[PDB]
Structures are given as C-alpha cells and as structure tokens.
C-alpha cells in the first residue's frame, strides 16, 4: 500500500513522500514484489 500496489503500480515516490512526513523517517521504498511501503 501507500503507493506500493504491486507490479501494475509500484510508486516508490508516493511511498517515499508518505514516509518522509512521518517524524523520525527520511524516506521509503516499495518492497516485497512492489506491494509493501517500507519507511526508513
């Protein structure tokens, strides 16, 4: 989710921007075949 909707729509930028607005995080990427937004 959060932009990471699998191979038909793997929107790393959307996930990154979700994550970046969470206190303590700086970015994010799609993981697990495109289906999971992982924040870091």
Swiss-Prot record:
Disulfide bonds join 4-30, 15-37, 19-39. Residues 6-9, 31-37 are annotated as: Binds to membrane interface. It is found in: Secreted; Host cell membrane. It comes from the Eukaryota. Coiled coil: none annotated. Changing residue 38 to R: No change of antibacterial activity. Beta-D-GlcNAc-(1->4)-Mur2Ac(oyl-L-Ala-gamma-D-Glu-L-Lys-D-Ala-D-Ala)-di-trans,octa-cis-undecaprenyl diphosphate binds at residues 2-4, 12, 18, 29, 31, 33, 37-38. Transmembrane segments: none annotated. Changing residue 38 to A/C/D/E/F/G/H/I/L/M/N/P/Q/S/T/V/W/Y: Complete loss of antibacterial activity. Antimicrobial peptide that potently acts against several species of Gram-positive bacteria. It selectively inhibits peptidoglycan biosynthesis through complex formation with the cell wall precursor lipid II (1:1 molar ratio) thus inhibiting cell wall synthesis. It does not disrupt cell membranes. Is especially active against numerous clinical isolates of S.pneumoniae, including all 90 different serotypes and isolates resistant to clinically used antibiotics. In vitro, shows considerable selectivity for bacteria over mammalian cells. In mice infected by S.pneumoniae, it has an efficacy comparable to vancomycin in the peritoneal model and to penicillin in the pneumonia model. Belongs to the invertebrate defensin family. Type 2 subfamily. This is Fungal defensin plectasin. It comes from Pseudoplectania nigrella (Ebony cup). The lineage of its organism: Eukaryota, Fungi, Dikarya, Ascomycota, Pezizomycotina. The chain holds residues 56 to 95 of 95 of the full protein.
């Amino acid at each position: 989710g959060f932009g990471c909707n699998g191979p038909w729509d793997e929107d790393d930028m959307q996930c990154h921007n979700h994550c970046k607005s969470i206190k303590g995080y700086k970015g994010g990427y799609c993981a697990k075949g495109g289906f999971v937004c992982k924040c870091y």
